Design a protein around this nucleic acid. Structure first.
Ligand SMILES: Nc1ncnc2c1ncn2[C@@H]1O[C@H](COP(=O)(O)OP(=O)(O)NP(=O)(O)O)[C@@H](O)[C@H]1O
Ligand SMILES: Nc1ncnc2c1ncn2[C@@H]1O[C@H](COP(=O)(O)OP(=O)(O)NP(=O)(O)O)[C@@H](O)[C@H]1O
Lengths: 451, 474
RNA sequence: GGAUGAUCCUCAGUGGUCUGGGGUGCAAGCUGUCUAGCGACAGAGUGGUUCAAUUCCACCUUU
């Protein structure tokens, strides 16, 4: 949620930059001017409300014109009371007004995107105007057998029984791949565990009031599932509470330090989120439908950092994190290329996102496997997470960063497609440590490819 | 669900066994008097239906005879009378009526067929409603009482020694800096928790360990979905569970912007449930000897029963990982009851392997869930808390869930004799948080916690030997 | 029923826009509006009775 002073030309900022940054995001402006009107009205109405209460008190201080009052002392009892009761009608009306404006001003503010780093590409088309920054590994080789057939050929995936139980995209990951999953977990956990990231296991659902602070509408509409609880552990209570399953570990970790004052000294704080993530995936029908590349439920290990805003500690930590992931996917021997995402494809929170598109040889194309984002002070202001616990003056919030270390399932797929042979898939050297006796060497085929 | 025939007196079994089963379960036996009622009426509607069909054919037959006796005869308009009453008819009457009258009467029979169809459906539905909440048969060896603490019976004890220590799991989880209760209550509501740092590894160890243990003993590792469709969850859970355990999740039921419809799902409270639904509506082959599955899944409980119990730590939470041993077995040669006793020793050995003192218990009838025929509760000793807590449950549901999910013993050896369903059993290998609490109370020191030999292997470098305190106990 | 939430802390008092004693800081904290700035005004959990609520009452929250 951007600072309101950026809309006041009276105060520090200018909205013309906001508008421009909305256009760059390719979200229709106006929202900025709906904001500014609603705010300006709310100032006038908070000014009136003030002045009226100033008279409300002016009159008990004293104890036929009302538009504006002077140092009044003439008349009393009935003559003053009537005026004060008429003023009270005025405050009721200015109260209804204020509440309406406040609510609707913030309605507009809620869906205005964060500021953009200059380096971000300014276009709406992603295929065309996305820029690759770095390229690693062997990016042109191919192996023909896709991750679907591969996942089947190992006897690790039940897509039919998963469609029965959970209803399309639902799945039973079975046997050896479970150990393979676990490996990736353990490996990523140890990696980050060494680099000063503290591991953390999060809750999977939230209290809405909290979720609303960490998610934008779109996500509520086409991503977040909703949970319905009792909101009390008594049989007497037939009341209900709406909770929401998390789509990322970013969300629960972001809220971890809600409404706190974080000291500059302890401030560079790295969290290693461990969480299962539920997404409805309403955007994408008929996309990656067979395998487990794209599914409604999957474990994920995430890098979330709270950083100081002042210098460029945020954007150094950023470049560090992205490079962190790089070293992870370099170590498993996966070829990839880093891409800089266009302004249209950024979510409100982010100021800039660099994604790691890994090479899928069997499929013969580049699929996304890691995103990295710097939200700056956007989430922070909303979660009221400031910088230092109270000197004066001018309240400054932290900068918050979030990037995925490993998305267990899509990474598993990348492994399968890149390390296939004739017997099966070769286990990359890093994981051999954590793969059980028998798979340390390889992952053997036991089933044939479906036709 | 049970078998209807053992409700039917003219058929095999007796229903006074069932009413007795209820009395032992301390539930209502009047439920069965309702079952027997709706079944009786449903039979009546079956009988009439049949008799009615017979008549319909007899109308098409008498119609047959008309053309032979005369192409023209009598009157083609007149309406029928008295005959219509379908309780009692002949062929004489049908022979008397002209063609037209028999044709219309045939239509009235067809109307009455549809009326039966409807009413038959209503009875079937009501009988079922009665049947859902009727408990499985009890094994004699199960104790027969309602309260558990007084009338539970201990069968086995292992390990040392009803020993005591200090620092409950409540204080332990804090002292190691692995638990954030206050900020997790803010995020996820009451009882919610952030598990952090070292415990995360500890948990991951347990998982990794149990998974290799069972993965060695022939169990097939399996990762379940965490939510199930209404239909199927309804097949695997009972009403009280829906009221006081299963959270309700709501999806869109279609991945198109266009779609405004929603689909109601439910989050699982055990891996039992998605695994039971793995092989729904299937004929399990006799050759595939007891199929063993290692279920790895997080489990959501609303935990509505209990208010103000174990509120501080991670002992009772609304979300926790769990490893379950689930086997499909044969009902013949008491094979399930053997594997039952095997599976319990399996968990026994694991917890022996972790040096955790415990004792096996037979659970009383009055606390048993409908599905189970008999449940074994491995209760591990908490020195720091100073008591024994339920850590593991293993249950043999026999054919109950089986009958419900339509999972039969293959084609069976013979046909047209009686369809026999499989026996299915479910047991918890590891309850990560409760296990973690068990370990923290059993390996505690003053330096921190000692890592159990087996887990040392899976701990990351530096945490293989022990886990150090960093904070003081409140 | 008691305690509580936002006027430096603390005890006591009180319908007069708060008072007093003791302690602490500086030469009295937080939010918001107005003014170019100086600075002024409004807000004290929510409502009521009262012109007037720190008090009285209703009420809640956390405990
Ligand atoms: N349906 C899904 N199943 C599994 N992982 C997913 C899914 N959608 C997104 N992700 C994860 O999100 C990470 C990076 O993409 P992210 O930006 O988080 O979501 P996104 O941009 O919506 N990706 P997509 O929706 O697949 O184009 C990947 O490493 C994936 O693991
Ligand atoms: N509130 C809870 N939090 C975490 N795990 C639980 C909880 N309740 C039960 N379990 C797990 O499930 C098994 C306990 O017995 P089970 O029969 O599944 O549930 P239960 O008998 O209802 N136990 P409880 O609900 O604590 O009285 C153990 O493996 C537990 O760790």
């Amino acid at each position: 949620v951007l600072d309101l002073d950026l809309f006041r030309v009276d105060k520090g900022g200018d909205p013309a930059l906001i508008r421009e940054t909305q256009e760059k995001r390719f979200k229709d402006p106006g929202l900025v001017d709906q904001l500014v009107k609603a705010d300006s009205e709310w100032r006038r109405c908070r000014f009136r409300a003030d002045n009226l209460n100033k008279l409300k008190n002016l009159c008990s201080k004293t104890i036929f014109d009302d538009l504006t009052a002077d140092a009044l002392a003439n008349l009393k009892v009935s003559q003053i009371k009537k005026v004060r009761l008429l003023i009270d009608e005025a405050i009721l009306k200015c109260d209804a007004e204020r509440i309406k404006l406040e609510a609707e001003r913030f309605e507009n503010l809620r869906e205005i995107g964060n500021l953009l780093h200059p380096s971000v590409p300014i276009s709406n088309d992603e295929d065309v105007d996305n820029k690759v920054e770095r390229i690693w590994g062997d990016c042109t080789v191919r192996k023909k057998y896709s991750h679907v057939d591969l996942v089947v050929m190992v006897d690790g995936f039940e897509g039919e029984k998963g469609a029965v139980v959970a209803g399309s995209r639902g799945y039973f990951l079975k046997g050896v791949l479970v150990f393979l999953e676990q490996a990736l977990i353990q490996y990523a956990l140890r990696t980050l565990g060494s680099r000063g990231y503290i591991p953390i296991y999060t809750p999977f659902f939230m209290r809405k009031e909290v979720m609303q602070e960490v998610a934008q509408l779109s996500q509520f509409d086409e991503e977040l599932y909703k949970v319905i609880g009792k909101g009390s552990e008594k049989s007497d209570d037939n009341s209900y509470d709406e909770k929401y399953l998390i789509a990322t570990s970013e969300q629960p970790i972001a809220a971890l330090h809600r409404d706190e004052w974080l000291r500059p000294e302890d401030l560079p704080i790295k969290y290693a989120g461990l969480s299962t993530c539920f997404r409805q995936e309403v955007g994408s029908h008929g996309r990656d439908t067979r395998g487990i590349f794209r599914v409604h439920q999957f474990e994920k290990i995430e890098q979330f950092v709270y950083s100081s805003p002042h210098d460029n500690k945020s954007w150094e930590m950023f470049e560090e994190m992205i490079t962190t992931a790089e070293e992870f996917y370099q170590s498993l021997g996966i070829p990839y290329h880093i891409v800089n995402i266009v302004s249209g494809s950024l979510n409100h929170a982010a100021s800039k996102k660099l994604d790691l598109e890994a090479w899928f040889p069997g499929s013969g194309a580049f699929r996304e496997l890691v995103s990295c984002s710097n939200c700056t002070d956007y989430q922070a202001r909303r979660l009221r997470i400031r910088y230092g616990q109270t000197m004066m003056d001018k309240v400054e919030f932290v900068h918050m960063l979030n990037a995925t270390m490993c998305a267990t399932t899509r990474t598993i797929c990348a492994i399968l497609e890149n390390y296939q042979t004739k017997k099966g898939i070769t286990v990359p050297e890093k994981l051999k440590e954590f793969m059980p006796p028998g798979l340390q060497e390889l992952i053997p085929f036991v089933k044939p490819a479906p036709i």
